[PDB]
Swiss-Prot record, chain A:
<comment type="function">
    <text>Cytosolic calcium-activated calcium channel that mediates the release of Ca(2+) from the sarcoplasmic reticulum into the cytosol and thereby plays a key role in triggering muscle contraction following depolarization of T-tubules. Repeated very high-level exercise increases the open probability of the channel and leads to Ca(2+) leaking into the cytoplasm. Can also mediate the release of Ca(2+) from intracellular stores in neurons, and may thereby promote prolonged Ca(2+) signaling in the brain. Required for normal embryonic development of muscle fibers and skeletal muscle.</text>
</comment>
<protein>
    <recommendedName>
        <fullName>Ryanodine receptor 1</fullName>
    </recommendedName>
</protein>
<feature type="repeat" description="2">
    <location>
        <begin position="301"/>
        <end position="400"/>
    </location>
</feature>
<feature type="repeat" description="1">
    <location>
        <begin position="210"/>
        <end position="300"/>
    </location>
</feature>
<comment type="similarity">
    <text>Belongs to the ryanodine receptor (TC 1.A.3.1) family. RYR1 subfamily.</text>
</comment>
<comment type="subunit">
    <text>Homotetramer. Can also form heterotetramers with RYR2. Identified in a complex composed of RYR1, PDE4D, PKA, FKBP1A and protein phosphatase 1 (PP1). Repeated very high-level exercise decreases interaction with PDE4D and protein phosphatase 1 (PP1). Interacts with CALM; CALM with bound calcium inhibits the RYR1 channel activity. Interacts with S100A1. Interacts with FKBP1A; this stabilizes the closed conformation of the channel. Interacts with CACNA1S; interaction with CACNA1S is important for activation of the RYR1 channel. Interacts with CACNB1.</text>
</comment>
<feature type="domain" description="B30.2/SPRY 1">
    <location>
        <begin position="1"/>
        <end position="168"/>
    </location>
</feature>
UniProtKB/Swiss-Prot annotation, chain B:
<comment type="function">
    <text>Has the potential to contribute to the immunosuppressive and toxic effects of FK506 and rapamycin. PPIases accelerate the folding of proteins. It catalyzes the cis-trans isomerization of proline imidic peptide bonds in oligopeptides.</text>
</comment>
<dbReference type="GO" id="GO:0006939">
    <property type="term" value="P:smooth muscle contraction"/>
</dbReference>
<dbReference type="GO" id="GO:0019227">
    <property type="term" value="P:neuronal action potential propagation"/>
</dbReference>
<keyword id="KW-0703">Sarcoplasmic reticulum</keyword>
<dbReference type="Pfam" id="PF00254">
    <property type="entry name" value="FKBP_C"/>
</dbReference>
<dbReference type="InterPro" id="IPR046357">
    <property type="entry name" value="PPIase_dom_sf"/>
</dbReference>
<dbReference type="GO" id="GO:0030018">
    <property type="term" value="C:Z disc"/>
</dbReference>
UniProtKB/Swiss-Prot annotation, chain C:
<comment type="function">
    <text>Cytosolic calcium-activated calcium channel that mediates the release of Ca(2+) from the sarcoplasmic reticulum into the cytosol and thereby plays a key role in triggering muscle contraction following depolarization of T-tubules. Repeated very high-level exercise increases the open probability of the channel and leads to Ca(2+) leaking into the cytoplasm. Can also mediate the release of Ca(2+) from intracellular stores in neurons, and may thereby promote prolonged Ca(2+) signaling in the brain. Required for normal embryonic development of muscle fibers and skeletal muscle.</text>
</comment>
<comment type="subunit">
    <text>Homotetramer. Can also form heterotetramers with RYR2. Identified in a complex composed of RYR1, PDE4D, PKA, FKBP1A and protein phosphatase 1 (PP1). Repeated very high-level exercise decreases interaction with PDE4D and protein phosphatase 1 (PP1). Interacts with CALM; CALM with bound calcium inhibits the RYR1 channel activity. Interacts with S100A1. Interacts with FKBP1A; this stabilizes the closed conformation of the channel. Interacts with CACNA1S; interaction with CACNA1S is important for activation of the RYR1 channel. Interacts with CACNB1.</text>
</comment>
<protein>
    <recommendedName>
        <fullName>Ryanodine receptor 1</fullName>
    </recommendedName>
</protein>
<feature type="domain" description="B30.2/SPRY 3">
    <location>
        <begin position="43"/>
        <end position="171"/>
    </location>
</feature>
<comment type="similarity">
    <text>Belongs to the ryanodine receptor (TC 1.A.3.1) family. RYR1 subfamily.</text>
</comment>
Length: 400, 107, 247
């Protein structure tokens, strides 16, 4: 009927910058593993027991607040159903205590390693303490949001994080079908531990507002008339010549002397580029069709010519120009090309990883254009600008 | 007997014998989660001996099963611990008691 | 006030409809007094309690969600659906399902008035819903120790969206008996002033603590991984309201 006051222990949570989520256009293996190493810990620093729980959490649902919250107090990963955890004896979810049988039946103690696994494709969260499997397994949870490792460390505890083999040596070998979390590091920034939804930071007093986050949707990476088809074929020949010049192999030949498989690949690429440009709703570029060869090729000089002796005959740099208003169109075309390439790779099973595991169906560049690396984005922009300049040199100019 | 869920393992080499004073640090609480009594906040360890019947019989049995340097959760049915009404103003009648007892040291 | 043939009812109506661009977004509404489930898990001694809501005309059932809500509900999304409900299932030896809320969608359930009812037995632990005297196969098993609140979230498409109806059934004790310890044996439904409706405000003021926990993180090594360490005893006083679980 009345209210009760007692001394509770302040709690806080930390999380590395890595994000793992599940969606239709998933760029991850769908099953990740991390290891947690616990150093010396005081069992009772204060009157209340130390609060130590490890598990996954949602990117938009689990927003721990220092102080008030659900339950009596000391909100952690088990205080709300937005996150799940395991304290050693009980599996907590939404501030509900449910004991889980363990081979050791021991709480979180020093000189122990905590190993947990989660599957994005099928809802299943499994954790093991010191290598001993735990019968209790979380299941039947919806895949919206992104699951990240998180520890609700207490005031007097010290813990060590082992995201992947690159970051630190694993105490136990990962289970089959589970990959270390170091392969899920975002390319934009290095993986560092940061507080979750923290509104305060240390200031040499640095107040912090809301933190921008990317949802699972962000994690996911026309007709060609014959008159335009001739220009598309000319652009295919020009692109093949430019690629041969850049690579300077039988492919290092002229535009009309390119190998048949190379010519077919160039034609397919030019057709895809023309379809993407037409889908953008740009202006009609069917002008000056006969002026395709207006530019003078520089491959005639020996220095520009390849070592094999063949002259690719590419477009002149001075003659080829790019419209300033077409930069946005070029960037959009490059982004669309990257997206369709990532979708094709995902169709074959390729996913984002820190390394290039081609036999394991892993694409290191399977990221959206917004989240793409600086080098890849610059290369895509340069390729789009070169294509636009080649089209302009052939008399095709559009406003977009 | 009362149920004992070992949160933290103990050596178990020594056990509290009859007539020997025992030192505990308990943090008992009710089923609903609202704590009612604890000896840790008071910073005064509780001292009692087996056979004096000062503590509840369930507490004495748990201490008998208890081991030095071991932390476990001890729950009591209302029959053994404060049957019917008991300790007015603290323990509601017909209410269970869950204790977190731990041996710092023996006599 | 409850009449001879009318149980004590609480009505929620839109003050402005179609004037000055009145908002029609879905609203989250929760009752004040919850029902406490019995810790033990084994006609006046019945452990079942029933409450009903009379959905007035002009409100589409597809935008009606009535049932029970866990006091850990912190969702204020306009796109409310049964599929978009946070829930987990614990499997050990044992298999139980715990969810933040337990509704049944009105659109799938059904100018007629849809009298949605909910039957909850604390001892049994199972929840049943009956509409217009017709039972439903939708059943949920909550944990033995729970503090579920009455739940009704509707989107206002009419001047009168939904109205409460706290009345005793033919043989089921009224919800007021379970809500109030003193009125446990009283079978006459009542509507005391404490039983007031509460909406989910999107943002509420909270005091920022003066002193925060000092946490320092660094890279332990190439093989030891990332390491964090905090050594600072910080304690806080907590005020918790028994009626609604909060700190």
């Amino acid at each position: 009927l009345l209210l009760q006051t007692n001394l509770i222990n302040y709690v806080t949570s930390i999380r590395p910058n890595i994000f793992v989520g599940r969606a239709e256009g998933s760029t991850q293996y769908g099953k990740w593993y991390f290891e947690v190493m616990v150093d010396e810990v005081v069992p009772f620093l204060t009157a209340q027991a130390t609060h130590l729980r490890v598990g996954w959490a949602l990117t938009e649902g689990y927003s721990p607040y220092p102080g008030g919250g659900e339950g009596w107090g000391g909100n952690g990963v088990g205080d709300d159903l937005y996150s799940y955890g395991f304290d050693g004896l009980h599996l907590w979810t939404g501030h509900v205590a449910r004991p889980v049988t363990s081979p050791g039946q021991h709480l979180l103690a020093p000189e122990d390693v905590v190993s947990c696994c989660l599957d994005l494709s099928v809802p299943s969260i499994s954790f093991r303490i010191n290598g001993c499997p735990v019968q209790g397994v979380f299941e039947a949870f919806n895949l919206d949001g992104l699951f990240f490792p998180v520890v609700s460390f207490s005031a007097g505890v010290k813990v060590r994080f082992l995201l992947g083999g690159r970051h630190g040596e694993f105490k136990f070998l990962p289970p089959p079908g589970y990959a270390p979390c170091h392969e899920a590091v975002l390319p934009r920034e290095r993986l560092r531990l940061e507080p979750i939804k923290e509104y305060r930071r240390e200031g040499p007093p640095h107040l912090v507002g809301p933190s921008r986050c990317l949802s699972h949707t962000d994690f996911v990476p026309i007709v060609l008339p014959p008159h335009l088809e001739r220009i598309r074929e000319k652009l295919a020949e020009n692109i093949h010549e430019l690629w041969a010049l850049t690579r300077i192999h039988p492919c290092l030949v002229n535009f009309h002397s390119l190998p048949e498989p190379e010519r077919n690949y160039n034609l397919q690429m030019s057709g895809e580029t023309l379809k993407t440009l037409l889908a953008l709703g740009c202006h009609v570029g069917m002008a000056d069709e006969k002026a395709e060869d207006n530019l003078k090729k520089t491959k005639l000089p020996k220095t520009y010519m390849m070592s094999n002796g063949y002259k690719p005959a590419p477009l002149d740099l001075s003659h080829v120009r790019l419209t300033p208003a077409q930069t946005t169109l070029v960037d959009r075309l490059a982004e669309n090309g990257h997206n369709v390439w990532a979708r094709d790779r995902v169709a074959q099973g390729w996913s984002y990883s820190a390394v290039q595991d081609i036999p394991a169906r892993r694409n290191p560049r399977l990221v959206p254009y917004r989240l793409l690396d600086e080098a890849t984005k610059r290369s895509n922009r340069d390729s789009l600008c070169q294509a636009v300049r080649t089209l302009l040199g052939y008399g095709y100019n559009i406003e977009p | 007997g009362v149920e004992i869920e070992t949160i933290s393992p103990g050596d178990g080499r020594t056990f509290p014998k009859k007539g020997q004073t025992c030192v505990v640090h308990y943090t008992g609480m009710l089923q609903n989660g609202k704590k009612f009594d604890s000896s840790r906040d008071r910073n005064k360890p509780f001292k009692f001996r087996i056979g004096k019947q000062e503590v509840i019989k369930g507490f004495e049995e748990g201490a008998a099963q208890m081991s030095l340097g071991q932390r476990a959760k001890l729950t009591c049915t209302p029959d053994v611990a404060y049957g019917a009404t008991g300790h007015p103003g603290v323990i509601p009648p017909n209410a269970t008691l869950i204790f977190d007892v731990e041996l710092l040291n023996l006599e | 006030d409850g009449t001879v043939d009318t149980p004590p009812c609480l009505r929620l109506a839109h003050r402005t409809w179609g004037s000055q661009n009145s908002l029609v977004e879905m609203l989250f509404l929760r009752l004040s007094l919850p029902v406490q489930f019995h810790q033990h898990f084994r006609i006046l001694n019945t452990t079942t309690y029933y409450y009903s809501v009379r959905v007035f005309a002009g409100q589409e059932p597809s935008c009606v969600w009535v049932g029970w809500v866990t006091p850990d509900y912190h969702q204020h999304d306009m796109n409310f659906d049964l599929s978009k409900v946070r829930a987990v299932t614990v499997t050990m030896h044992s298999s139980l399902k715990c969810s933040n809320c337990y509704m049944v969608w009105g659109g799938d359930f059904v100018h007629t008035d849809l009298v949605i009812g909910c039957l909850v037995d604390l001892a049994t632990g199972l929840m049943t819903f009956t509409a217009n005297g017709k039972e439903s196969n939708t059943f949920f098993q909550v944990e033995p120790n729970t503090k579920l609140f009455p739940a009704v979230f509707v989107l206002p498409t009419h001047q009168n969206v939904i109205q409460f109806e706290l009345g005793k059934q033919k043989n089921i004790m009224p919800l007021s008996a379970a809500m109030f310890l003193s009125e446990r044996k009283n079978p006459a439904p009542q509507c005391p002033p404490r039983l007031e409706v509460q909406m989910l405000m999107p943002v509420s003021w909270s005091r920022m603590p003066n002193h925060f926990l000092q946490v320092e993180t660094r890279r332990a090594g190439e093989r030891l991984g990332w390491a964090v360490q905090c050594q600072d005893p910080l304690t806080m006083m907590a005020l918790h309201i028994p009626e609604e679980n909060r700190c």
